[PDB]
Amino acid sequence: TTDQMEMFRIPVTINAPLQQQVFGLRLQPGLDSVFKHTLLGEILNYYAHWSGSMKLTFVFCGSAMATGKFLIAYSPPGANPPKTRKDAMLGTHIIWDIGLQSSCVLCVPWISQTHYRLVQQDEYTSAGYVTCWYQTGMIVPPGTPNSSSIMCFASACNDFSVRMLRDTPFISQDNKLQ
Amino acid sequence: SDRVRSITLGNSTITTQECANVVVGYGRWPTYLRDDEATAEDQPTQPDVATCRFYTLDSIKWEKGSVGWWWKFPEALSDMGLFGQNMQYHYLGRAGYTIHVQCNASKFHQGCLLVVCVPEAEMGGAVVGQAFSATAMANGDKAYEFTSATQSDQTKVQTAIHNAGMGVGVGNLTIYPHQWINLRTNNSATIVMPYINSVPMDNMFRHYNFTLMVIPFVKLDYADTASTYVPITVTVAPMCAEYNGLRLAQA
Amino acid sequence: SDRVRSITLGNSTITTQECANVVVGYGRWPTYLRDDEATAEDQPTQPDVATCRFYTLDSIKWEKGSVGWWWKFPEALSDMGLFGQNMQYHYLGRAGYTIHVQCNASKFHQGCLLVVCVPEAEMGGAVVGQAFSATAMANGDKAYEFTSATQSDQTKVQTAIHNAGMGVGVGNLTIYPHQWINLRTNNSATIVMPYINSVPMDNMFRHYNFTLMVIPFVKLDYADTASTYVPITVTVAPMCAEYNGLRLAQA
Amino acid sequence: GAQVSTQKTGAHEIIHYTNINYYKDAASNSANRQDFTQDPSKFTEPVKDVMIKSLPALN
Amino acid sequence: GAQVSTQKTGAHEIIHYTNINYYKDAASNSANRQDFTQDPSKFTEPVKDVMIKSLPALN
Amino acid sequence: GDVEEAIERAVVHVADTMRSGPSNSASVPALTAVETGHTSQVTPSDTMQTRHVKNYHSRSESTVENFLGRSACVYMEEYKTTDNDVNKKFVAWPINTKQMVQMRRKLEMFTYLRFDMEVTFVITSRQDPGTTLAQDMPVLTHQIMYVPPGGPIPAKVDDYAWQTSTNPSIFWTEGNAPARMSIPFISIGNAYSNFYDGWSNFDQRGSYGYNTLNNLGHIYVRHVSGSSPHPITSTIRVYFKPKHTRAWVPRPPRLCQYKKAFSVDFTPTPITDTRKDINTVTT
Amino acid sequence: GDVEEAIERAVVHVADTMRSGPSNSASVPALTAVETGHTSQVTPSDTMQTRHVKNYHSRSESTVENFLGRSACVYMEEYKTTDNDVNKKFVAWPINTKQMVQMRRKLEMFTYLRFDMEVTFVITSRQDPGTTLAQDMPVLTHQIMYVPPGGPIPAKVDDYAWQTSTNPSIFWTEGNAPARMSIPFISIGNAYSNFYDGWSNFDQRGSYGYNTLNNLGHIYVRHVSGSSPHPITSTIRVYFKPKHTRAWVPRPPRLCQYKKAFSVDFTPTPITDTRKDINTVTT
Ligand SMILES: COc1ccc(CNc2ccc(CN3CCN(C)CC3)cc2)cc1
Ligand SMILES: COc1ccc(CNc2ccc(CN3CCN(C)CC3)cc2)cc1
Ligand SMILES: CCCCCCCCCCCCCC(=O)O
């Protein structure tokens, strides 16, 4: 990415194979580079334990005449992340229909063996994966751009909580400021 | 607004923002088998959320020259999640279904699809007499295509579209539970099918309960656009499923 | 008479005509997880009779020179009926067990076996340090044999019988839930194990809940008979099993 | 806010002591080393059917 | 002049502690780290017209 | 009561999870519109079947009182008992909270703060190396002086200003517990301001930024009368601990490293770290 | 009450002995069957004539609370005030209870434990030998820092990480009473696990054993600013003391000697010592 602002937008195209992946990411809110510096990751990085559910909100920023459907799925921890949509659809998922309402919410449930998870997540406290796939494909009429973008928003639910204050590793100094 | 619908089965959800009403079988909602109608004596197993959930049945392309497709159930789900495992391990089964068909296009496209569930859709062979194996009409979740011209290969079914492969007028399929996808108005279709059979339970591998058909009555058309085809996707969710007669697997 | 027992789980039954009492874990009977102790939010699945049934775990020979065997659970049932399928398809699991060990011999034989269930039976390697793969102590339902002499191969566990592979006196295993099979008196042993762990649920592939051990304290002996060995069989039935976190299979 | 409770016997036998908590966390309290309840049945009598000592065991 | 209030739970669960102030300035008191009220509506729902979650947002 | 008054607080606990079954209706909780500036309030119960769960988790440790209620170092400096340079035998620090990075970032998550303060001083001494170190010296004593703005300032270790008649001071002897005190809310305004987007002069000229509102005074330290035959160096550390805290107008945490003690100046930094491609999920 | 509430506990006392006379009946208390897994509950009153005895013995000292309620050393290490090697001037210990044999064996008699903790630190210093020892040095000061998992770690004695704004710390001066504190139950699970028969990865690979569940953090120690002309060595000892203890699933005490700090590995050992023959009873 030669332009930093390009990081926030997820590309989408009119013609794509029938099943194709839009994006994939690990659900490590305090450790993954995707969530590391968000407004939620920054708060988490001051603590050692966390628990509760999360909200991922997706907004379509294409033309008003564009249309499509997307499948967004959450796969709990396992030995292998999903490779195809057939695999992804076996886990928690929602079918998103783009229309007058521009946004849809994937609520990631709290499925864990322990009451709490480490912020510095290790293999013992894995949390799973999130992936998005084409459900029907994006269709456009004549006289519209051939590409569109999506954005993602992350936040915590009302059952979220943290524990065990600690110092954040993101900020450091080598000499006294003057 | 009544053009928005949301369906939640198990750990999966379906949302549609431009849709018609919901069609419920013959006015009957799926339900469990009663004590005064059962015949098998041993306790049934009811996996509930493990099996009653939406499964996405692969996808197909709608071209200007498409003629139609069909799927046979429950064979189409024979290898899908724990539903397939319960089918393999049990002698008897019973379940209703929710069928959702997605197809979206811009305001400048035109076309119309008929979505219909045909119970006991017995089909005839391409050559009168003879016989065909159980691969000419069901091989998993893959879709089978109708043909505009009369079929000639003796190893497959008579795929002439205007007869629907059953020797009946294609225009009269409106008698079965059905819905239309007209691109001007809606982009989805939803049908709830109760369990229909002459016996309380039946083996899910030997018998095809019903057949899903999608037929373009008004062929797709468009002009001056970069979108060359309109994908069609099918999603199905068993409802109130229960099984009986555990044995070695395979079937 | 109190020497007869009958156990019915699912579609399977066990009958013993010469047996001792039944041992129930730590005085606790298996039960489902309560609402005020759960942590996972989504609905569990409870297959009931489909999974809670007796499975026969292959068989072994008791010779005059046998030293002992062990099985690790729930790995031993990892590929057994629908229990294995539910293990594969779910992230979390929870279940109690009923263990029945059969061993019968005439009135002219002699010998004694200790049957004990060891929770968290962590074992040490043959060579201090080093490491071993998850095949030296669990490869399905196959039984692993203890050794009279000290183990030397670095690729497997320290099988010295008198230490039980845990660095403790073999004679003190009486502290765990246990029972004896003394050929003079009984021919079976029955133990009911509740779910014991430090968390409400756990992944059934990553973690071994408990280990079953069968150890001949008094070696088998006989004279002038055509029976050269005494088979031993193990049967296990999960109880109150429930699962959570559906995902792609494998684990 | 002051608890008064008996203290363990000793030689020559006001056998009362006073305690007050100063900190806001229950983890700061002193050890509760005066509970003496116990029940060995969980390990000594784990059988299902009750066994009478005077009666014969097996039948 | 002595306040008595409950102390936070801990393992194994007189859960009471006593406090007295010795200085004449309120700034000398100890931290009041036992208030747990909170209300996120100021930042999560700053809109004028109330929005019903089950209803559609825009119209 | 009179002798014993009973207070009563309460545990709060996070929201429980309610049992949810299959649904088929026109309501669409999942669909919303972020354009309104409204954060969706959906819960897992609204998009999937859930069991009843009773949570006992509490958000006790996330309160601002507990978040900011930890002692953090704000300044350290060294001064010698005897030396040729007069300025090197005592310290003089203009009070501010921007010197140390960690507590600075903790504070700058809010725009306005109002709290009492608890100040603790840690002092340690060591003998300087040299060719001859054999000496006998009694225990040292130190003085900490606080001079509100506008007061006289000492110019040398034995100045007259050290005879405080109104400036508060502390005399501390080595080997004892660290010194400590409490300070009330001493701002002229209704709250402390971490940020100030404005100028000092009315015609938009002069100093710019929070440097304009820092008028908290100075702190001075010296050895009372210790003057050893051989040099001895002492170091003082100052720790601040907010009490009875209140905060307003949260703002995003800083991303770029700090570079000046009295300015927001920075160097542009990437938003975050990179990965192979948008589908990479492996380690 | 309000001022004084009265608690009420109770002595328990072991069972008394009842008078027993001659008997001749069909009941056979002495005969039983161990095959049932049942431990016989016979008493001397059931097999011989006995007098009435009133016991006043109590099992107060055998409770788990008292058994585990003793401070035991868990770690010691040395660090020098001045040296050429940077890594040798401070300590960094990953917290665990498997380092010292005695307390390890005491703990491993149970499978799961849940308790609060009381930690005490004992620090002593001594001058290193050398050709010239004449120096004068004031009293030293030490810092103990606790870093929960994932936090920044200091790389040298004068690193920035030592300015804890959120990590708890203690500053202690030599000559006073040892430092002490209390710690609550800080496990993510519902109880500590001494043993873990499982793997880290879902496909049964990676780390094995209790090493997988040890994520308690680190402890760091340094001299605050002491740097003597001649080296001085300090040693720290850490003592743990469980409080409010609960235990589950007892297991037999270990027989073989320990050989690794993070493994159960062992060498086979004889069951017990031998004697001349099965009838030998003399010394
Ligand atoms: C005399 O004993 C003292 C004296 C001063 C202090 C420091 N008191 C103090 C320091 C900082 C802030 C926060 N303000 C934020 C806006 N910035 C412009 C100025 C600092 C408030 C009070 C402690 C003990
Ligand atoms: C910061 O002040 C502290 C920090 C940590 C401790 C040690 N706390 C501690 C140590 C050990 C166990 C027992 N666990 C058994 C299972 N094993 C895998 C991990 C250790 C519990 C708590 C003390 C003071
Ligand atoms: C932080 C609490 C300090 C308590 C000091 C000792 C007690 C002084 C008051 C006398 C006892 C009465 C206590 C009470 O009223 O409950």
Ligand SMILES: CCCCCCCCCCCCCC(=O)O
């Ligand atoms: C400067 C005040 C010193 C108080 C000393 C501790 C309290 C002694 C009196 C016992 C508690 C009763 C207090 C009260 O009557 O309110």
